[PDB]
DNA sequence: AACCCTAACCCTAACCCTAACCCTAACCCTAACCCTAACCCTAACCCTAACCCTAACCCTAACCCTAACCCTAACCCTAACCCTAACCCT
DNA sequence: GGGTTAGGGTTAGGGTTAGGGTTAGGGTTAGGGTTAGGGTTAGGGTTAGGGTTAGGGTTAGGGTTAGGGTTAGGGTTAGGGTTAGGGTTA
């Protein structure tokens, strides 16, 4: 838990350089902001289903394999980490 | 002196021909324990775990990236729009 | 005979109870009786994984409490979650 | 020891069936053992749904004047609520039918201004 | 002559008004079963099985539309084009 | 004299002012022109698939007879659960 | 310690006959463990209710083979089940 | 903003209701015109919701 | 009734004793594991690009049938004259 | 928000096994925790080089006009195709 | 679930012409890029110390199962409470 300067953790030349891995030549002004909220949003689904499967488990670490299974439940099937 | 129009697409192919993370580590796991402890403090977390997670949300951001661009290019406009990533939200149904 | 198992004394009786002076159509209850079948394959089903994944093969009344907060909302899941718990008090008090 | 007769079973206003549940679940390899506090949590988690679709599908069929529950009732009544919509967001009621909702920017004259002149 | 504009939103909230439906029964029957031909030979239909395909048909249908008009009144049309459709199966991921 | 099997005219029968009003439902005011075979093709390919299936799953259980509740669990498999019909 | 099941054995065999001099790497490994085990537990899975919706309880050849048509497209569909055809031919002669 | 407030019940006459409806509209127009009692204009069409018969 | 069938020769009938009978006439002495498959396939375009240019010189006369007097007129575009059963 | 005349489907009793909910004893099998020690999460810092931040000059790019002409908007006489009972079987 | 014989009336399918909707041409005046420069702030070594991770006997409170009784539960059956259309009134 830290102060309210991590929310704004995606600046504005690292994230163009994020966008031209897709096809992205020019973006706007808003999306540093827009695309933090999405990411918040999703961000905190992922977050609430890792809390509920290591509640399940009774654990309180969350591993890789229950962001695996909680990303496949979502419908996001990820590989490398876990099995 | 070169005119605009050629280092964007040089720097779209060095970045596509190499797989190196972008985002930083720390700054992350501060913001998911952050997150975490709203819901339930004394928490912790691992490194595979906030390794997926970043993977995770770099192929979302990826994904989404793209379909604002694919958005954006099909009504005669180069630039993408606040607006095409809320629209691009709303098709695939994610609100 | 061999009848055909569906949900309409239940559901008639809970529809009384909600509202008097009121009942069911011809398709509403076909509808009716597809929905509890859904969800009764979808709250049951991830029971057993999640007792899979910790290596256990007991589902009782965490297994299905938890499962309330991954299928239903929030609002819904907590009342879910608290009508639960009451019936599970009930029944432990007296059998 | 029979004593008289104990209504139970369907106990605090729980008309759902409490052992059906257990039945099918047994039967449906889901596991190889189950317990007795699951099939009380399942089937009051079933009627608490049923009982709010039912009286949030109620409502909205006094609305038009009719005390039968229609499809077109369930379907304007699911695609209401917000957590009803979040969890059944990819059910399809048959002879349902779509919200009743417009869209805006139809019109493309808007101002109509005057292109011609007052003097013929 | 009077200014078009609003027998298109009495059509449109009098078939929203109403439950019925706008697709024929013996049309699509002959041509799910000439589609079931190019499979396998000897196949029958019934009543509740071509009933259900055409409501997930009709349900699909209007569904498609309504992303097609939504696509083509934010990009300062009116109208839709036959690209939208296309626009709208690749990102919803169903063509690829 | 006697005989005759099936044809192809079938496949045109989505006309033109009945998908105008099929259209309205939704919130379409004005379609176009290849739309009528746009829709088409869509409509046949997406039939195309749901009728393997379902002959895929009327092969399993051995039968001839495509019924609804088969239909009704292609489309939940294929991610559709219809409602209404079946069990 | 409690050994983990993992498939690298059997995985660079075939390796080793689709390809000589040719192996596998580090996060592939697992890459392949997690996307054997993902499709392990869906054609199994179709199998049981594919069963159960006919009254049954008898997954035998035919389940798994009508299963790799829903799974599968199209070309590799019948590729899969002419060799599963082919295999409990050969299991069932000797 | 009169003539757009008017052109909507098919009057292309600026009417003092038209101008009130006008007026207690904009958000910008609100704050600067809030102690100005427009005569013969009415009030806007506001109903609570716990008046309405709901459930 | 009507036959079930309805198949309508999918391709077939041309199989072991008929593409080796064939291939043994050029030259052709043993065969491998697939040669078949799409040796009936490449058979399809042949009937396929030069039947219907038959029908359609057929549809100019308002004619339905294909005779012997326009079945050379169609080979003849593609650059193969048949002497004898065409005249 | 006629609500009514039409009017059958939602409508309260009732009801006969009745098939699943509960009982009643046996078991029996399914979670902490206290020793423990090993290695991975985290805590101060130095450098120095690619990486990043900030003005000037200007050449394409999006938008707002202007006229312009061809496609999709709205009846009309139909009269062919879509329903609406009623049995009948294989 | 198919397949028959009436029929007939709502629905589908032939002209038509006129009004506003894309499309085509010319600066336009506001709008991103870059190369020259500098001042970083993230990319790498050395630790080391506490804060977690990770296996193991041992219950007793958590469960699982073969037997009844039986309250609750599942197909039919009326006659009545608003539900669909048709002229009126609005």
Redesign the interface.
Known sequence: ??LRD??Q?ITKP?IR???????????????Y???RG??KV???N????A???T???KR??????????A?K?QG???????? | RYRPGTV?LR??RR??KSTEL??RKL??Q????????D??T?????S??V???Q????????????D???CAIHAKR?????KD??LA?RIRG?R | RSRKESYSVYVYKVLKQVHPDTGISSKAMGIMNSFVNDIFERIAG?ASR?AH??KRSTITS??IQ??V??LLPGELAKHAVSEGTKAVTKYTSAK | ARAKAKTRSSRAGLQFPVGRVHRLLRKGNYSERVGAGAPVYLAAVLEYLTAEILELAGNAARDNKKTRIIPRHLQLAIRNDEELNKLLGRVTIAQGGVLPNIQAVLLPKKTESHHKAKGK
């Not at chain 1, 966008?19 to 973006?27: L, P, S």
């Not at chain 2, 180069?78 to 606040?82: A, G, K, L, Q, R």
Request: proline share 2%.
């Open positions: 838990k830290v991590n929310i953790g690292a350089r994020l966008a031209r891995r897709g096809g992205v030549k020019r973006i706007s002004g808003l999306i902001e827009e695309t999405v990411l999703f961000l905190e992922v977050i609430r289903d809390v509920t499967y509640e399940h488990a309180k670490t969350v591993t890789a394999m229950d962001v695996v299974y990303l439940r996001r099937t990820l590989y490398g980490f876990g099995g | 964007a720097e779209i970045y596509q972008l985002i700054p992350f501060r913001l998911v324990r952050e997150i975490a402890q819901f339930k004394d928490l912790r977390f691992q595979s775990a390794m997926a997670l993977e995770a949300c770099e192929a979302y951001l990826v994904g989404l990236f793209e604002t661009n694919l180069v630039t993408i729009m606040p990533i809320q939200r994610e | 991830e999640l994944y910790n965490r297994e938890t499962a907060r991954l």
